[model samples]
Structure formats: structure tokens, C-alpha cells
Target: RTRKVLKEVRVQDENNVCFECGAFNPQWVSVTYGIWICLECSGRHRGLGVHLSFVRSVTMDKWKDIELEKMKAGGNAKFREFLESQEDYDPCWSLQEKYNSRAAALFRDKVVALAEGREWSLESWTPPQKKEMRILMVGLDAAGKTTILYKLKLGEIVTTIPTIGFNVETVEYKNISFTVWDVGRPLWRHYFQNTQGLIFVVDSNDRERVNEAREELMRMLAEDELRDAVLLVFANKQDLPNAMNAAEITDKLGLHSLRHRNWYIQATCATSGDGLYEGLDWLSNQLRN
Candidate 1:
């Protein structure tokens, strides 16, 4: 009778209910030296209580619903804050700093060795891998193109000297790379030999120049190279009292006819970084897709 009862009980850990949340077959759990706890309750107790050494076999999809919830909430920020309040918060930062200090010391040692007439055998040094993306910017004079580029690169307000021609710089974000090109407003008609993306900046405060800006945009679309490229419009000078809103500029320019549904027109104050990051983020996401 005892053997029959034991056999009737579900022995498979994969089908067993979680000890904390009561959910079945949790994807992961934490073990405290000898005891196992569900992932949900792992944080409820201090980290010292959960060793997580032993794990029952489980299907990857078992915790899909909970994982989706955590992702939607943007990764348990409240738990992180609680962890930071502990004495041993962020032991990883100390390790990283130590490694960096050691690297710097080695670099200084190599320089000193070279100065002291010590010779070291040369070894092949491979360059780090890099990814490159191109972004092209265009606009009429005083459209805040230069100011925008400077702020994106330097993250500070800078007095502008008029750009004579094109300026190029590389910007990196989270390992993704972009070559940003700021083409001079006066040279709008000059053909870009290998432009990839188009960022058309317009002075939203200058209503009189709207018609001329539209004509220039039409001319740019006529160019074979830019016709198929992603087009972005920056409606700049939004901080000014007279600046036009994004909807007004878009309606005035009749941008819907461009046939590029992914095109974005944004109202921005580039000098203050307001709305600039959103515009760039949108452009980057479009390029990535």
C-alpha cells in the first residue's frame, strides 16, 4: 500500500509545483545551500539565503508568462534598489575598476620599457571588430544643423560658426556605430556620392522659407541616390515662440506624398537636446529594421 501511494505521487521535478509561487515547473529557482526556492521568492529573502546550486530539470517555456511580465516592467528596478541598500552592493564594479587599473599600469610599464632601451618582440595585433552605418544631414542655412550635430557629438551647447561644406563624425551607441554627415546648407544641390540616410533639417520659425525648403526637398528626391533612402525631417527651433509644430510643418511640406511611410518629422530644440534624442532613436531603429 505504501509503495502504491509513493508510485502514485508525481516524482518528476519538471511537473512539480514551485515551492514559493505555487506555479508548476518554473524555469529557474534559487537553492539556499541545500534548500530550493522559486525564482519569485529568491529576492524576497536576502541573497545570502539562496545558493541556487541544485536545479530541477524544467522546460524553457514554463516561466514564459512571468519572464514576459518582468521584461514589460523593465527588469525589476525595485529589487535592484533594495540590493543597493545592502553592504555588498555591486561587488562587480570593484573588480572592473581593478582590472582597468591593472591595464593602465601595464600600458605605462610598456612605455617606460621602450624609453629605457629594452626591446620587446613584436606580435601581430588584430584591430577590434567594428560595425559602420552612415547618416546624412541636410538643411538650409540657420536651420540649426551644425548646432544639432555639435550637441549630439559633444552633449553641450556650442556657439556655431557657419559650416562651409560637409562635416563627418562617427557616433557609437551600445556597440552600434554610425557615421553622421552634416552637409552644408549652401551645398544642398551637390550630389552625395554614397549617402545612405537623409536627415533634412528645417527652420520651423522661418515660415517664409517653407516653400523654398519644399522645392529643395523635391529636387533631392529627384536624385537617384537619395530617392530610395530613408528620409527624416527635423523641424528645428521649437523653443522659439514663432516656431512651427511638427504637424504644421508636415502639413505645409506635404510630406505624406514622399512614399516613405517610415519617414519621421520631429519638432526639436537641438540646442537644449529636447526631442533630439527621440528623433535620433527613431532614425536608428528604422535603420536597424
Candidate 2:
């Protein structure tokens, strides 16, 4: 029955959570003051070395009555009441669904500042700014082109229907915004007319269709819209038997005919994210220049 006391140690406050930082489902506790906390806050408390803070895990450590009763009596709500100078100076925050690196750091810092008697507004936070870049993926329909875009996105792994529709996705890399269209069907270019970069995917094993790919590529290269944009050519489906190698792909795509363009051709197994990222690495660099 002594272990039943362990259940009492569990913070049964309507909002059982860290007295600081506002992280939900806390796993650590500050035993010196019987306050629940997140691991991160526990670390910071330990770092202070003299906050009189002794951190222990609710799940990992054993606690006796003194700490357990303290935890039971206190949480973010009670602690806010204890620390708040005026009713208007309340310090409770809505539960954060997720936290970015900088916000997480800021949250922890605020906890320390409060402990050291600083005044501030909890809602006064501005998110970091990000720049946006737009790119389009254009290619034939039958070459598992849809699969390449679908695989890059974290969704249905199965092959998609070759039916006519727009396959568009907003993607990000290097703090930039981008849009990718699988180019499922030639339904009048929606976002590609002013596109910044292009990912040209080809079916590596479609030996008989190389001529067709060449035709389409040349037609695209001649376009005024895509002129001077970064080009990433993915020679995909290397796992298929007898797929054309990278050099053969180079030959078929008529890379030799290209006069002036920042382009790259890499063999890829999109299923494994290999040449895909390598191509993106090159793509990002070229755009940066």
C-alpha cells in the first residue's frame, strides 16, 4: 500500500504541468519546491545550481511525502497565483502544440526571468521571419512522376492514378518557401509561368521514350518562363531492372545541346531519398548564387 502513496505524488491539479515554461504532460519535478516541470526546465534549474531546485522525474524517480504533497498542492496555476504580483500580472499560457528552437529557448528564459523577479507580457512574442521561393516539377505523366512528388511528401506511398489533375505541394528548404507541381497533365501552367526552379524527372528505364523526353525538354527549355532558372534533372527509378545509367540519361536528355543553363543530372532511387537531396543541394546552391 506504500506504493499507493506514489499515486498521490502524481500532480492531480486540473492542469498538471510544469510550473514554468508551460509545457504540457510534464515528466520532471522540482523537488525543492514540489513543482512539476519539463526535462528542459529541469536542466536549466540544475544549471542555475542555486535556484534551490532539485529536479526529479514523475515517472523515473521515487518521491516521499514532502515532495509529493508539495507537487499535489502546486502546479502552473497555483504557482502563478504565488508569483503573480497583481491579478493583471498572471503568467499562465495556453498549451503550446509545438515549439520551434528559438521559441523553446525563449520560453525557458522567461521562466528564469520570472523566478528572478522580472516583469513581462507572456503574449508578446513574434515568430521568426522566413523568405519564400517558388519552384515547379514538370514532366511526363507515365514515368512515375507522381510517385516522386508523392514520396517526397509524407503521404500515401502507393502509386497515384495517372488521371488528369493538378498535383501541387508547398515545400520548404533552407528557410525558403516553394511550390512543386507533379505536372500530372498539361492543364495550362498555373504556377510555373514565373517559377524560380524546375525539377525535371524522367523514367530511367523508358529507353523507347527517350526521344519523347528530349522533345519535351527542348520545348520547355525554349520557353521564356523557365529561362535562367535553376534546373534539377532526376534520373529516377534506378531500382528497376536495366534502368539507364546517369551517363546514358545525360546522352538521352541532350545535355550536350544545352548552351547556357545551371542544370544537374543525378541518378536517383526516390524511394530512398538519395539523388533527390543531392540534386536539391545543388539546386539550393545555384539559386543562392
Candidate 3:
């Protein structure tokens, strides 16, 4: 079952060396990152929480759905391509050294850390308390709030009419359950009192309404009620031809003034799945710290 699954997902690349050190056939696999690993590096990966990388010996144990689903995505070679495409990212230099003793562990950690967006601070950062999270999604009319909500819930594009009152649903990802509320204006502020996180959705192509989106964000930030909650701004509609990227939307929204708080600006194409999962991955990371 394992070999069949791995081959079907393209994990059966011709170069069967370790994904990190290019050593012998990697004896272990990381369920979280979907990469194979050598035994030495596998021990270090197991040191990270099980949620980060469920390390399993390829020759030892039976696989589960959680691991299977993660593996269904293209594995080692795919990840190599993914990492290589990032302009600012660099793989561990230890891997470049042919005879480096600790190269495998270092390279493995680097990839795992970068994949989870935890490369910024791993040792020093402490995660927040574990609890069911309540999140509020807010934005102007037609700013992609409802679309983002349903997209996360249903995993497909649904026609979104203007939401008059509110939309409530619980969505689970990465084994964490989030009770998400999508409400506009006054009611959004009401839920602000208890929301652990805020997702301020914006229409990236609506240049004329950018100031309105900026003003709405300002007003929300001014509230003392949500001073500590994680703030995630979605620069949505990225698939649109004229849509601004995350950086442009950040500058327009004046997110630079928000350096003190835990916040993120993420580009998303809500219609397609691009950047949506990554945006949520960031939300989970920020809330943890």
C-alpha cells in the first residue's frame, strides 16, 4: 500500500537518495512535509512535535489517513521545486557539503521549518494556549469575505450574494477547529469582543474602494477590544488581471503602522485555492506565537 501510494503521488523519483543529504534510500518519511528522510535526520524530526512532522519508518509501520492525504501531494521532488522557486529562500548550506556529518539533520530541519513558516523563530517562540478558536471575518460589501468563508468551508467557489446579516460556520484545517463568523460593519464589531483572530478581507482589484477598506481596517484596529488578537488581511482576487499583490495592498492599507501586533498580509485568489491554504497556515503560525 505504501509503495503503491508513493508511486502514484510521484514520490518514486529515480534519485532514491535522502531528500536532504542525497544519502542512501531514505528510511523514514515526514507526513507533514511529504518528504522522505534518512534515519539520523528522522530522529531530529521526531523531536519536533508530532503535529509538525509525523515521522514514520517506511519499513516499520502502517500509514494512516492523515499521513496518506499529505503524501498524496507530490513528494520529495515536488518540494525541491517548491523551495527552489522561492526567491528569498535558501536551502541549508550543510547539504552542499558532501561529507558534512550533521548535514542531513540540518537540511531536514531547514526544509521543515521553512515549509511551516516557522523559520523566523523556532526555539524562542512559544505557542499560545490550546483552545477552540473563534475567528471573525470582516470587510466591505463585495470585498470577498463571504467568498473566502465558503471557499474554506466547501473547498469550491460558491456564488456569493451580499451577506445581509451574518454567516456562521466551523471549519477545520490542520486538525484545528475554528468557528468562523462573517459579518459586516456593526455586528462585526460586536463579535470583535471575543474573537481570537480577525481576517480582514479586501478586494485587490477595487482600487477605487481601497481607501474605504483602509479606513475600515483603521477603525477596527482602533478598538481596544481586539488589541491582542492576531490580524490577518487577505489581499483577495489575485487571479483577477488587475489585482494588486499582497505587498501593494499592504502599503495601500497602511499595514506598516501595525508592527507591534501579531499581523500578516497574505495574497489570495479566493475563486481558486491558490494562497488560501497558505494564508490560513500563516494565521495558525501567528496565533501560536
Candidate 4:
């Protein structure tokens, strides 16, 4: 249960009801917006992502004095006032835009104004924005490239056909974010220009094609556009019988004696979600340094 003092704060005028739907006896709190939300509406906020709505259990999570102060500073009435004043406001307006779109910019301006009226800075209280990187996910066809992408992104073993054009997913992991552009087939040089990192997915079970992977890997390394990009090789499909381990894939990929390159090879099984985040973890650390 929540602190006794919080029970006092929630019932204070506008704080008793859900901010989005006005449901009775709201308990979930969106700390990002400092507003009360109900069980039904809190589910939607969770889907909206932690970057937008940082939801916490009103009766479960530990609270600090500053958090309660933030709750008192904002409530349903204040949010409704701001939303109603907007020219584009509609009764059927979606929550996605309310928190992630132009409304966010408008509310941020309002937050700034509130902070200026006092000595304390609103920026100090808000979560810091995540740093983003553009990663080119490249490999030969049927390398489980698309599978690895979605696995790292959604943690689900989604059914995937061979990508025809390209697949793009923004994966947030371990406090860092990276947009992976999984290019289809062998036409990936077009995407090398702005890529900050590269993930080369290898089907470790394909022993007959290791040289083919090496040829493609070597070909891409020669591209001037990808010269500075960090490399993370995924020795994928580790769950399969007779799959090559990281060392074998490293040797097969000719990573041995590779000079002047920032590279790492991690064993991964996309279907099982193993070693995938470790690959991203290396990419994350490499980018930060």
C-alpha cells in the first residue's frame, strides 16, 4: 500500500480521478506527467513506453518526498485545462499524440514557465533524453537478420519472411537506443553512408557458406562509408545442431588478424533470446566510448 500521506494527496480535489479517462479511484501514477491514471488507462500508458509515461504503482512502489511534491504540483484539472486550451483538442484525441507528439512540446513549454516562476529547474526533475545511434543490420539472406532485429526489439520470436526491401526497428536496451536498419538481400551498400554501427548476422549452422559470409564481410569492410562504423557480429542460430561457436565463426569470418577495427562476435540464438542483448551491450559501450 502507498504511504498514508499519499492517500491524503490523491483525494485532494482533482487528484482523485484518472487524468486520461476520469475513472473512479485511480491508483496508478504516471510520474513523467505527474498525473493519476486507472488500471485500464495505465495499460495504455505502459504501451506508450517509459520514454513518454513513466508509470509507477501508487500502492506498491516506494516514494520519495520530491515525488509526492511533483504529484501535488500536477493533477487532472491542470492537464485538462492545458489540453482543452489547445486548438487541435478533440474528445477522441489519442493518448499516443497526447504524450509523444506536439502536445508534449506544448506541455514542455508550460513546464519551463512553471520552473521560471521558482528557483528550482524543471529539467532537473525530468528524465534525461536517451542518446540514439543509427545501426546498419547487414548480412547475407537467411542469416536470421530480421529475426534478431525483432527479438532484440520486442523480445518475441516473431515469424519473419525474407525482407524484400528493408526492416527498421528502434530498439531501446540498457539505457541506450539504436535504430537498426536491416537491409534486404545483398544491396546494403546504399545504407552505409550514415551508419554509426554494423551488426553482421551469421547463420552459424550454415557450414557450407562460411566463406560466402567472409567474402561479403570483407567486401563491406572495404566500403569507405563504413570505415568508421563499429562492428558486432551475431553468430546466430546457436540452438541448432552442429552450430558454430563464436570462436569458429570469428575464424571463419576472418576477424583474426583484423586490424584497426572495433569489432565483437557474440553467439546468439534469435528464437531463444540468448546472447542478443550482449551483442547490443557491446555496441552500446563501443558507441559511448
Q: Which pairs clash (backbone N, Cα, C closer than 3 Å) in model 2?
A: none
Candidate 1 structure, TM-score to reference: 0.45
Candidate number that wins on TM-score, 3 or 4 = 4
Question: Candidate 3 — number of clashing residue pairs?
Answer: 0
Question: Which pairs, if any, clash in model 4?
Answer: none
Report the C-alpha lDDT of model 3 over 74-136, residue by residue, as the tens digit.
377766665555443323111212112232233345545554445433232122235434566
- Order of quality (lDDT): 4, 3, 2, 1
Q: Name the regions of candidate 2 deviating beyond 4 angstroms.
A: 1-131, 150-190
Q: What is the per-residue lDDT of model 4 for residues 1-289, given as tens digits with 9 covering 90 to 100?
A: 2477678768765877777656678889876556788887787778878767778888688776656655655567776676777665533233554465555555544543453454433244222332433476777778887677676653322121224665544433333334444322443454454467888888999999888888888887888888999999999998998898889999888897788889999998988889998888899789887
Single out the weakest 10-residue window by summed lDDT for candidate 1. 91-100
Residue 156's lDDT within candidate 1 is 21
Instruction: Identify the superior model by lDDT, candidate 1 or candidate 4.
Output: 4
Return the TM-score for each candidate structure.
0.45, 0.47, 0.47, 0.48
Residue 189 local lDDT, model 4: 51
Q: What pairs collide in candidate 3?
A: none
Candidate with the greatest TM-score versus the true structure: 4
Tell me the TM-score of model 4.
0.48
Could you tell me the lDDT of residue 223 within candidate 2?
A: 74
lDDT of 2 by residue, 1-289 (tens): 3246445555455345555545677777765444677776676556533334557776667666555544544455544444444332311111121122233334344555454456646555343321434566667666655566666663222122223564444433333434444332343343444467877888898898777877877877787767877788889888889999989999888897787798889788887777777787788788778
lDDT of 2 at 228: 74
